[PDB]
Ligand binder design. Sequence first.
Ligand SMILES: O=C(NCCOc1ccccc1)c1nc([C@@H]2CCCN2C(=O)CSc2ccccc2Cl)[nH]c(=O)c1O
Ligand SMILES: [Cl-]
Ligand SMILES: [Mn+2]
Ligand SMILES: [Mn+2]
Length: 178
Amino acid sequence: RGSHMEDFVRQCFNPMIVELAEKAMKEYGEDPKIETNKFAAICTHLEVCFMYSDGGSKHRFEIIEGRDRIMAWTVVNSICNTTGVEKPKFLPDLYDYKENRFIEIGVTRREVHIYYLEKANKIKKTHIHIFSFTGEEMATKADYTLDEESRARIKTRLFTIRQEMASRSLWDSFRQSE
Ligand SMILES: O=C(NCCOc1ccccc1)c1nc([C@@H]2CCCN2C(=O)CSc2ccccc2Cl)[nH]c(=O)c1O
Ligand SMILES: [Cl-]
Ligand SMILES: [Mn+2]
Ligand SMILES: [Mn+2]
């Protein structure tokens, strides 16, 4: 039972992202063949996390997302036990060695302010950075970590993804799936 959305995800995202996404959902008991919008959302978030860590200097970011849950907590333990930063209650996506804070990266198909609130209500010290499929962004204390060009090409890619699904009539299903 193979959807259009699943075939589009495999042709739209690079194979390392797709496989990390697949491992992730299976690890949490989800099927990329069925929960195809989530499949698409996971790849998107993953690609945004990787572009984001690429925007800094060489050694600036540790990448927490995309790892096995046990190994992700292992690295945050090490980060915490060497920088003296409080251990987050939930797994974040990155750690910033320059600013010494964990980052939760968000990608939403709804309005900037709500997901941040939803995200901030659940987080309760880590930095939050939200990106939209429309090109809006919001970060904690209005501190956006990266320079403008790095975030700009993230927004550019999100909108390209938007168009590629719209041209395949899959955008409507994806927007109202969140
Ligand atoms: O790391 C995360 N979860 C760890 C576990 O995730 C899986 C992995 C596979 C299957 C089920 C959960 C994480 N999760 C969330 C949302 C809200 C909290 C649970 N959640 C989700 O299940 C939505 S899947 C999602 C959707 C859009 C963007 C990104 C993602 Cl991951 N959003 C994030 O930005 C994020 O990093
Ligand atoms: Cl930098
Ligand atoms: Mn994450
Ligand atoms: Mn995230």
